[PDB]
């Protein structure tokens, strides 16, 4: 239906649509992607796609900054994220990884994930995951949406400006016919 | 009449179907069809006009002046709805249909709606006394049990999760809400109410 896993083609069409349209026309961008909603497109752009996100490995300075902030403001990742420099989901996942790593290094020499163990694993948030690599024949509906997107990105010329040029062409054809009739007369 | 080009509909069900077009144009006509014009052009008359026929009565010339009939004064909508509104007779269908008889209690009081079929059973020599039933009827009970709800065989389900005045309309596009229910209520007398409650 709607949603999914953000295949690489969808991410690329999102980047091109932001190139051509801007960051304040998410409904128009989401018209390109049949399987996604404007909220989902905006969420992916602001959570994964936009170039401002630093997807590189964690430097040590930002790691200690993250530790200090996570101590200062318990929870509250949406405000920790701007100060750290990464996104909120990145900060939360990094903090959880540090806690799990400390527990693993603790086990060699010897937090209650048992509460988190009593249930299943955390279901990953769809918009924050890396895009699925595309298959050689990535089905066929994607080709259809790619063709529509390609026609969309370069169409330009407005919508109803196609009437005036056509009318000029028809007038040129009719005047050419009139002149040709006169010369054959 | 070529039924118009039928390719226009294609798929695209109701909520994306453009608008009905009387003459391949987007426009309603008729007072009760949504148009701001009714009749010919907001008028009673017609394109050609209308004249009464000549009259002459001399006890032999009025014989050519016959009476008046239903069809001669109606139009295409009127005839269409006259055909639509003709429902009567039936009779024979109603006598041999529906639920003739079943279960011992109904045989006694309820009239056997089978009627002529009782004579047919006389032809079969039913002589049932105690009636005979078949496990299909236990499957006919399945017509009144469930169709399953995508659950497992042993799933016991839960009892909290199963669920099942007039005037003019507010407008078909104006929807429903807390606003549009009967303020005057006297329904649900006791079927929603218990007859007793445990005290302990």
């Amino acid at each position: 239906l709607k949603g999914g896993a953000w295949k690489n083609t969808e991410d690329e069409i999102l980047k091109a649509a932001v190139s051509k349209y801007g960051k304040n026309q998410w409904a128009r961008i989401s018209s390109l992607l049949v399987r996604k909603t404007p909220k989902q497109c905006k969420a992916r752009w602001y959570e994964w796609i936009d170039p401002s996100i630093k997807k590189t490995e964690w430097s040590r300075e930002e790691d200690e900054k993250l530790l200090h902030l996570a101590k200062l403001l318990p929870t509250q990742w949406r405000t920790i994220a701007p100060i750290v420099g990464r996104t909120a989901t990145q900060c939360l996942e990094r903090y959880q990884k540090l806690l799990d790593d400390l527990e693993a290094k603790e086990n060699e020499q010897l937090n209650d994930p048992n509460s988190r163990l009593r249930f299943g694993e955390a279901e990953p948030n769809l918009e924050t995951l890396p895009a699925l690599p595309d298959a050689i024949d990535m089905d066929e509906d994607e080709k259809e949406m790619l063709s529509e997107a390609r026609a969309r990105l370069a169409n330009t010329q407005g919508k109803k400006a196609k009437r005036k040029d056509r009318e000029k062409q028809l007038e040129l054809t009719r005047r050419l016919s009139h002149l040709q009739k006169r010369r054959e007369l | 009449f070529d039924l118009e080009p039928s390719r226009i509909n294609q798929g695209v069900p109701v909520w994306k179907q453009e608008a009905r077009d009387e003459r391949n144009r987007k426009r309603f006509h008729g007072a009760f069809t949504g148009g701001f014009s009714a009749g010919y052009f907001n008028t009673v008359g017609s394109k050609e006009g209308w004249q009464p026929k000549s009259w002459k009565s001399s006890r032999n010339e009025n014989k050519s002046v016959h009476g008046m009939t239903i069809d001669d004064i109606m139009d295409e909508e009127d005839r269409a709805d006259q055909e639509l509104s003709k429902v009567y007779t039936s009779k024979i269908n109603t006598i041999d249909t529906s639920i003739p008889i079943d279960d011992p209690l109904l045989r006694e009081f309820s009239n056997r709606d089978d009627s002529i079929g009782e004579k047919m059973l006389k032809n079969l020599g039913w002589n049932g006394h105690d009636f005979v039933i078949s496990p299909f009827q236990g499957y006919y009970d399945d017509t009144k049990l469930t169709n399953q709800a995508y659950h497992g065989i042993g799933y016991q389900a839960d009892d909290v999760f199963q669920l099942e005045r007039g005037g003019f309309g507010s407008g078909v596009l104006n929807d429903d809400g807390i606003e549009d229910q009967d303020i005057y209520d006297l329904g649900a007398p006791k079927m929603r109410y218990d007859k007793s409650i445990n005290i302990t």
Binding site: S19, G22, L72, L73 | -
Partner: protein, 50 residues
């Protein structure tokens, strides 16, 4: 280059669109009182629990 509209097509690369904002000039820092606040709260929590 506007975040809102452009009547013609004129695709603009992401570097120019990104560079056109005052996000950098608006500083991102946190006051020093948050530290003292959090330490006091954690200490009183531990003391009250014990």
């Amino acid at each position: 280059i506007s975040n809102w509209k452009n009547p013609k097509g004129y695709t603009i690369p992401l570097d120019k669109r990104l560079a056109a904002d005052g996000r950098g000039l608006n500083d991102v820092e946190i006051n020093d009182g948050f530290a003292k606040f959090s330490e006091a709260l954690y200490t009183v929590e531990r003391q009250a629990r014990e």
